[PDB]
Design a protein around this ligand. Structure first.
Ligand SMILES: *[C@@H]1O[C@H](CO)[C@@H](O[C@@H]2O[C@H](CO)[C@@H](O)[C@H](O)[C@H]2NC(C)=O)[C@H](O)[C@H]1NC(C)=O
Ligand SMILES: *[C@@H]1O[C@H](CO)[C@@H](O[C@@H]2O[C@H](CO)[C@@H](O)[C@H](O)[C@H]2NC(C)=O)[C@H](O)[C@H]1NC(C)=O
Ligand SMILES: *[C@@H]1O[C@H](CO)[C@@H](O[C@@H]2O[C@H](CO)[C@@H](O)[C@H](O)[C@H]2NC(C)=O)[C@H](O)[C@H]1NC(C)=O
Ligand SMILES: *[C@@H]1O[C@H](CO)[C@@H](O[C@@H]2O[C@H](CO)[C@@H](O)[C@H](O)[C@H]2NC(C)=O)[C@H](O)[C@H]1NC(C)=O
Ligand SMILES: *[C@@H]1O[C@H](CO)[C@@H](O[C@@H]2O[C@H](CO)[C@@H](O)[C@H](O)[C@H]2NC(C)=O)[C@H](O)[C@H]1NC(C)=O
Ligand SMILES: *[C@@H]1O[C@H](CO)[C@@H](O[C@@H]2O[C@H](CO)[C@@H](O)[C@H](O)[C@H]2NC(C)=O)[C@H](O)[C@H]1NC(C)=O
Ligand SMILES: *[C@@H]1O[C@H](CO)[C@@H](O[C@@H]2O[C@H](CO)[C@@H](O)[C@H](O)[C@H]2NC(C)=O)[C@H](O)[C@H]1NC(C)=O
Ligand SMILES: CC(=O)N[C@@H]1[C@@H](O)[C@H](O)[C@@H](CO)O[C@H]1O
Ligand SMILES: *[C@@H]1O[C@H](CO)[C@@H](O)[C@H](O)[C@H]1NC(C)=O
Ligand SMILES: *[C@@H]1O[C@H](CO)[C@@H](O)[C@H](O)[C@H]1NC(C)=O
Ligand SMILES: *[C@@H]1O[C@H](CO)[C@@H](O)[C@H](O)[C@H]1NC(C)=O
Lengths: 55, 276, 149, 198, 163, 50
C-alpha cells in the first residue's frame, strides 16, 4: 500500500536561532514527493535513518 | 580592521607586507570624492534660484502636476513622489569596518535646483542660460519654438486650444504608465543590485578556511603557540588581500562607466533643457 | 592634530582642506568570564594510575565527559616523557573549554612509537591504527620495564 | 592669468598622481615580504641553493603582485586620459574650425570664435562670447490686424513704448516702423488672442 | 562564555528563544544573542562605537588652528561640541547664517574660516522674476567676454622591465 | 577598396588581440609553477597526500 508522503520530514538541523533569513543547508533530509511502505512485527532495515511516522 | 580584527601581532605580521593598506584607501577616497563632483556637475548649472510666480496664466497649459507643492515633506511634486515611492540615524557599522558616508548634497537642495530650473524654463524661455532672465509670455515662447523647426508661427496662434488639450492629455497619461508599470525604472535598479551583491560576497567570503585550521583569528590565537602559530596566521592574510584587491578593481571599473553616464546626462541637461 | 596631518601628508605645508589621519577604538575594560556549575573530579586519574593495558588488535576506548580536567598537574609531572601535542598547545589546555574527550590506552614496541603520528605511513601505522589527517588531541608514551617486561 | 596661480589644477593633479604612483611602486621594493632580507644578493651570499630558494620565491611573488597592481592602475588612468583626449579633440574640431550653435558647449553665452594655445601636457582654449545687458521691458502684442486682416511679423516681435507700435529683433533694440515688407497676412482677427487695433 | 571569546556591549535582549537553542546569529556569522550557562537568561551583543578621524584646516600659511571631526560615533562618548548628521565636530562655533561656502563636510553642513565656523550652505541669491503676459524684456547693450578652459591630452610615457 | 590591402585595420586588430589573449591564456596550463610536474594526473599518483 504505497503512499505519497508529500512534504513531511523537515527538522531543525542545528541549535542556532535565526530570523527572516533564507538558509541553504545540506544534510540527510527526506526527499519531497516520496513513496512510503505502509505496514501492519517485521524486522526492517536501517540504512542511515528512519522516518517513523505513525497514527 | 577588516584583515586583522582587533589583534596586535596580526598587525605585526601585516607590517611585513609593505604598505598594502593605504593605496586601497586612497583609491576609495578618490572614488568617494569623485562621486560628489558627478552630482555637482549636473544640477548646479543655474547661478540664482528662481521661484514660480503666483500667476498661473500660461495660455491654457496646466503645469500643476510637476510644480512643487507646499504641502509636502520636502516640497516635492507628484511625479517626483511617484518616482521616489517606486524605488526600494547614525548606527551603520559592523565588525568588518564597512562604512557608508552620506552625500554632501541633500535631497531638499536637489529639489530646489530642479524647481529653479523648471521655473526659469517656464518664465524666461531660453535666455536664462546665456545672460540674465528676461520674462516673456509662454505663448510667444511656444510660437518661437515652432518657428525654430520650420513651421510658421501662425499655426500655433490659431490652434492653441487643441495643442493645450493634447499636452494636458499627454501629461495626464504618464501618471498611469508610471504607477502601473513597476518595471519602468530598469536602469536605476541594476547598479544598486550589483553593489549589494558585490558587498554581500565580500562580507561572506570572510568565513573561509583558506587552507588554515579555522576561519576565525581569536580561536586560533588562543590555542596555538605563537612560535608555531606564525604559519597558521599566514595563509589567511594572503587571501583576504586578494579579495580586497579584486573588490577595489571591480569598484573602479564599474565606477568609470557611471562617470561616463553622468557626463552624458550633464551634456543632455545643458543642451536640451537650457536651449533647443 | 596638525602634527598628525603633517605626518600623513609628509610635508611642512598643508593647503586648506579636510584630511583623514587615522581611526580610533573604544578600549574595553572589566573582562568577564562565565562557566557552568559542573563540580566533580574526573576519573582520568584512575585511568592513568591503573595500568592493565591491551595491545593493538584490541585497543580500549573510553569516554570522558562532565569533568573538571586538570592538565597542568600532569604536564609538570616528569613520569611521562613525550608530549609533542599537535593541534591545541600542551600548555594552553586549561583556558579552552572542550566538548568531549576520548581516551585510548595500549602498549606498543619501542620501534613504532614514532609511527603514531598523522600524515605518515609505516608497518603498524598504516595497517593497524591510523590517525586521521586532522588533529586528534595528542599522544603520551612512557617506558614500562617492570610490569609487562 | 599672470598673478593668480593654482588655476591649472587638472595638469598638476595628473602629474602628482603619476609621480605618487611611481614613487609608491619604487618604494614597495624595500620590504621583507616574509623573507629574511630585502635584497637577494645578501640571501644568496649567506645561504646555499638547497634552501635559499624559498625566500627567493616569496620575494618574487610579492614583487609580481605589486607590479600587477601598478600595471592595472596605469591601464585605468590611460583609459581616462584617452577619454579626455577624445573630448578635447572633438571640441577643437568643432569650435575652432567653425561656429557652434549648441548652447553652453564653448563658452557661456552666444559663441563667436576661439583660439587654442599649448600647455605642458594639455591645451588651453580662449573662447570669445557675446552677452547682453542693460535690459528694458515694454508692452508686447502677438499679432496686429488691419482692415480685418491679421498681420504677423516676418522676423522679430511687436513692441510699444506707450503710444506707438514698432517691430524689433529679439536680441537687440532697433525700432522700425511697421510696413508690409516685414509683415505677412494670415486669416482674420477673430480667433487670435491678443489682437490690438492699429 | 564557555570558550566563546568576544568583544562588545551587552544588553537585555528582547528576542525569544525556543527551549532548545543556545545562541542566535544573523547574516553570515555574527553572534548577537547568547544564553548564560548559570543563571539562564538571554543577552544580546552589539558593537561599541568606532570610526575614523578627520581634520579640517584653513591652511598653515593663513592660520595655525584646526577643527576635529569624528565620523561614526556621535558626541556622547568622546573623552564647542556640535552634533551633525554625519559624526560630530569639536572646535567650530555654529552660526545661524548661510553663505556660499568653502570646504564641505556632509549632509549639507560645511565649515570655513571667517575663526572656523560651521553652517549650512546657501544655494544662491534668490530673486523672483516678475512674470506677466503683457510685457517683454529686451536688452539694449552688449558686451564681449573671454573665457578660458584647460584640457589634458597625454601624460608621461614610462616603461618597466622585469628582470 | 578591392585593391588596397590592410584597410580594415581596426577590426583585424581587435580580432588578433582577442585571439592572442585566448592563446596566451591557454598556454599558461603547462607552466610548472614550482611543483614537481606540470600535469596533475601523475602528481596525484606519484606522491603521498601530505
Ligand atoms: C491641472 O491638473 C490638476 C491635477 O492635479 C487639477 O487639479 C485637480 O486634480 C484632481 C485629480 O486629478 C481632479 O479630480 C480635479 O478636478 C482637479 N481640479 C480641481 C479644481 O480640484 C487642476 O484643476 C488642473 N487645472 C487646470 C487649469 O486644468
Ligand atoms: C595515584 O593517584 C594518587 C592520587 O593523587 C597519587 O597520590 C599522590 O602520590 C604522591 C606521591 O606519593 C603524593 O605526593 C600525593 O600527595 C598523592 N596525592 C594524593 C591525593 O594522595 C599517586 O601518585 C598516583 N599514582 C601514580 C602511579 O600516578
Ligand atoms: C514712442 O516713440 C515714438 C517714435 O520715436 C515717439 O513719437 C515721437 O514723439 C516726439 C515727441 O515730441 C515727436 O516730436 C516725434 O515726431 C514723434 N515721432 C514721430 C515719428 O512722429 C513717441 O513720443 C514715443 N512715446 C513715448 C511714450 O515715449
Ligand atoms: C478694433 O476696431 C473695431 C472697429 O472699430 C472694433 O470692432 C467693433 O467694436 C465695437 C466696440 O467693442 C463693437 O461694438 C462692434 O460690434 C465691433 N465690430 C464692428 C463690426 O463694429 C474692435 O472691437 C476693435 N478692437 C480693439 C481691440 O480695439
Ligand atoms: C547620540 O547617541 C546617543 C546614544 O544612544 C543617542 O541617545 C539615544 O538615542 C536613541 C535613538 O538613537 C533615542 O531613542 C534615545 O532617546 C536617546 N537617548 C537619549 C538620552 O538621548 C542619541 O539620540 C544620539 N543623537 C544625539 C543627537 O544625541
Ligand atoms: C520691468 O517691469 C517691472 C515693472 O515695475 C520692473 O521689474 C520689477 O519691478 C518690481 C517692482 O515692485 C519688482 O518687485 C520685480 O522684482 C521686478 N522684476 C524683476 C526684477 O524681474 C522694472 O520696472 C522693469 N525692469 C527693469 C530692468 O527696468
Ligand atoms: C493677460 O491677458 C489678459 C487677457 O488676455 C489681460 O486681462 C484681461 O483684460 C480684459 C479686459 O479687456 C478682462 O475682461 C479680462 O478679464 C482680463 N483677464 C485677465 C486674466 O486678467 C491682462 O491684461 C494680461 N496681462 C496680465 C498681467 O494679466
Ligand atoms: C532657536 C534659536 O535660537 N533660533 C535663532 C533664530 O530665531 C534666529 O533667527 C537666528 C539668527 O538669525 O539664530 C537662531
Ligand atoms: C513509489 O514507487 C512506485 C513504483 O515504482 C511508483 O509507481 C510511485 O510513483 C512511487 N511513488 C512516488 C514517486 O511518490
Ligand atoms: C549555578 O550556581 C550558582 C551558584 O551556586 C547559582 O546561583 C545558579 O542558580 C546555578 N545555576 C543553575 C542551577 O542553573
Ligand atoms: C599666504 O596667504 C596670503 C593671503 O592669501 C598670500 O598673499 C600669500 O602669498 C600666501 N603665502 C604662500 C607662501 O602661499
Amino acid at each position: 500500500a504505497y503512499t505519497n508522503s508529500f512534504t513531511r520530514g523537515v527538522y531543525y538541523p542545528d541549535k542556532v536561532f535565526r530570523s527572516s533569513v533564507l538558509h541553504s543547508t545540506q544534510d540527510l533530509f527526506l526527499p519531497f514527493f516520496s513513496n512510503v511502505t505502509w505496514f501492519h512485527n517485521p524486522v526492517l532495515p536501517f540504512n542511515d535513518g528512519v522516518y517513523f511516522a505513525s497514527t | 580592521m577588516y584583515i586583522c580584527g582587533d589583534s596586535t601581532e596580526c598587525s605585526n605580521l601585516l607590517l611585513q607586507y609593505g604598505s598594502f593598506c593605504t593605496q586601497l584607501n586612497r583609491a576609495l577616497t578618490g572614488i568617494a570624492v569623485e562621486q560628489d563632483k558627478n552630482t555637482q556637475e549636473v544640477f548646479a548649472q543655474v547661478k540664482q534660484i528662481y521661484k514660480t510666480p503666483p500667476i498661473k496664466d500660461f495660455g491654457g497649459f496646466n503645469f500643476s502636476q510637476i510644480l512643487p507643492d507646499p504641502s509636502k515633506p520636502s516640497k516635492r511634486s507628484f511625479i517626483e513622489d511617484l518616482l521616489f515611492n517606486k524605488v526600494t540615524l547614525i548606527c551603520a557599522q559592523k565588525f568588518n569596518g564597512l562604512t557608508v558616508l552620506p552625500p554632501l548634497l541633500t535631497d531638499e537642495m536637489i529639489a530646489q535646483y530642479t524647481s529653479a530650473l523648471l521655473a526659469g524654463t517656464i518664465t524666461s524661455g531660453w535666455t536664462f542660460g546665456a545672460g540674465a532672465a528676461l520674462q516673456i509670455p509662454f505663448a510667444m515662447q511656444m510660437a518661437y519654438r515652432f518657428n525654430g523647426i520650420g513651421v510658421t508661427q501662425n499655426v500655433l496662434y490659431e490652434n492653441q486650444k487643441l495643442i493645450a488639450n493634447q499636452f494636458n492629455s499627454a501629461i495626464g497619461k504618464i501618471q498611469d504608465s508610471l504607477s502601473s508599470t513597476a518595471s519602468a525604472l530598469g536602469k536605476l535598479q541594476d547598479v544598486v543590485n550589483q553593489n549589494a551583491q558585490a558587498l554581500n560576497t565580500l562580507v561572506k567570503q570572510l568565513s573561509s578556511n583558506f587552507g588554515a585550521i579555522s576561519s576565525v583569528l581569536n580561536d586560533i590565537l588562543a590555542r596555538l603557540d605563537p612560535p608555531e602559530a606564525e604559519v597558521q596566521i599566514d595563509r589567511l592574510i594572503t587571501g583576504r588581500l586578494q579579495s580586497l584587491q579584486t573588490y577595489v578593481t571591480q569598484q573602479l571599473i564599474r565606477a568609470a562607466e557611471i562617470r561616463a553616464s553622468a557626463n552624458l546626462a550633464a551634456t543632455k541637461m545643458s543642451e536640451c533643457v537650457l536651449g533647443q | 592634530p596638525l602634527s598628525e596631518t603633517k605626518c600623513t601628508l609628509k610635508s611642512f605645508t598643508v593647503e586648506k582642506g579636510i584630511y583623514q589621519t587615522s581611526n580610533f577604538r573604544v578600549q574595553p575594560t572589566e573582562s568577564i568570564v562565565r562557566f557552568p556549575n559542573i563540580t566533580n573530579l574526573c576519573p582520568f586519574g584512575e585511568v592513568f594510575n591503573a595500568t592493565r593495558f591491551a595491545s593493538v588488535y584490541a585497543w580500549n576506548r573510553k569516554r570522558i565527559s562532565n569533568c573538571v580536567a586538570d592538565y597542568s598537574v600532569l604536564y609538570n609531572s616528569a613520569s611521562f616523557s613525550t608530549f609533542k601535542c599537535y593541534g591545541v598547545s600542551p600548555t594552553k589546555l586549561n583556558d579552552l573549554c572542550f566538548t568531549n574527550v576520548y581516551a585510548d590506552s595500549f602498549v606498543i614496541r619501542g620501534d613504532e612509537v614514532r609511527q603514531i603520528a598523522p600524515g605518515q605511513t609505516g608497518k603498524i601505522a598504516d595497517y593497524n591504527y591510523k590517525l586521521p589527517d586532522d588533529f586528534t588531541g595528542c599522544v603520551i608514551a612512557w617506558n614500562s620495564n617492570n610490569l609487562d617486561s | 592669468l599672470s598673478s593668480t596661480a593654482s588655476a591649472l589644477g587638472k595638469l598638476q593633479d595628473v602629474v602628482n598622481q603619476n609621480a605618487q604612483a611611481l614613487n609608491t611602486l619604487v618604494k614597495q621594493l624595500s620590504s621583507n615580504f616574509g623573507a629574511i632580507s630585502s635584497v637577494l644578493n645578501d640571501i644568496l651570499a649567506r645561504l646555499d641553493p638547497p634552501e635559499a630558494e624559498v625566500q627567493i620565491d616569496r620575494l618574487i611573488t610579492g614583487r609580481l603582485q605589486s607590479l600587477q597592481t601598478y600595471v592595472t592602475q596605469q591601464l585605468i588612468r590611460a583609459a581616462e586620459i584617452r577619454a579626455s583626449a577624445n573630448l578635447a579633440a572633438t571640441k577643437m574640431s568643432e569650435c575652432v574650425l567653425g561656429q557652434s550653435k549648441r548652447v553652453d558647449f564653448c563658452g557661456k553665452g552666444y559663441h563667436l570664435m576661439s583660439f587654442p594655445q599649448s600647455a605642458p601636457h594639455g591645451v588651453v582654449f580662449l573662447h570669445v562670447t557675446y552677452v547682453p545687458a542693460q535690459e528694458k521691458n515694454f508692452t508686447t502684442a502677438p499679432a496686429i490686424c488691419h482692415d480685418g486682416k491679421a498681420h504677423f511679423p516676418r522676423e522679430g516681435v511687436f513692441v510699444s513704448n506707450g503710444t506707438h507700435w514698432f517691430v524689433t529683433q529679439r536680441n537687440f533694440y532697433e525700432p522700425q516702423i511697421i510696413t508690409t515688407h516685414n509683415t505677412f497676412v494670415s486669416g482674420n482677427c477673430d480667433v487670435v488672442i491678443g489682437i490690438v487695433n492699429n | 562564555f564557555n570558550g566563546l571569546t568576544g568583544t562588545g556591549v551587552l544588553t537585555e535582549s528582547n528576542k525569544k528563544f525556543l527551549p532548545f537553542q543556545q545562541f542566535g546569529r544573523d547574516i553570515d556569522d555574527t553572534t548577537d544573542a547568547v544564553r548564560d550557562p548559570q543563571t539562564l537568561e538571554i543577552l544580546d551583543i552589539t558593537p561599541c562605537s568606532f570610526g575614523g578621524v578627520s581634520v579640517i584646516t584653513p591652511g598653515t600659511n593663513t592660520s595655525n588652528q584646526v577643527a576635529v571631526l569624528y565620523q561614526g560615533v556621535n558626541c556622547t562618548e568622546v573623552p564647542n561640541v556640535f552634533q551633525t548628521r554625519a559624526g560630530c565636530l569639536i572646535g567650530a562655533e555654529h552660526v545661524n547664517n548661510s553663505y556660499e561656502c568653502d570646504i564641505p563636510i556632509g549632509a549639507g553642513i560645511c565649515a570655513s574660516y571667517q575663526s572656523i565656523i560651521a553652517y549650512t550652505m546657501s544655494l544662491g541669491a534668490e530673486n523672483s522674476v516678475a512674470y506677466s503676459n503683457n510685457s517683454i524684456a529686451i536688452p539694449i547693450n552688449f558686451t564681449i567676454s573671454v573665457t578660458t578652459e584647460i584640457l589634458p591630452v597625454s601624460m608621461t610615457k614610462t616603461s618597466v622591465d622585469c628582470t
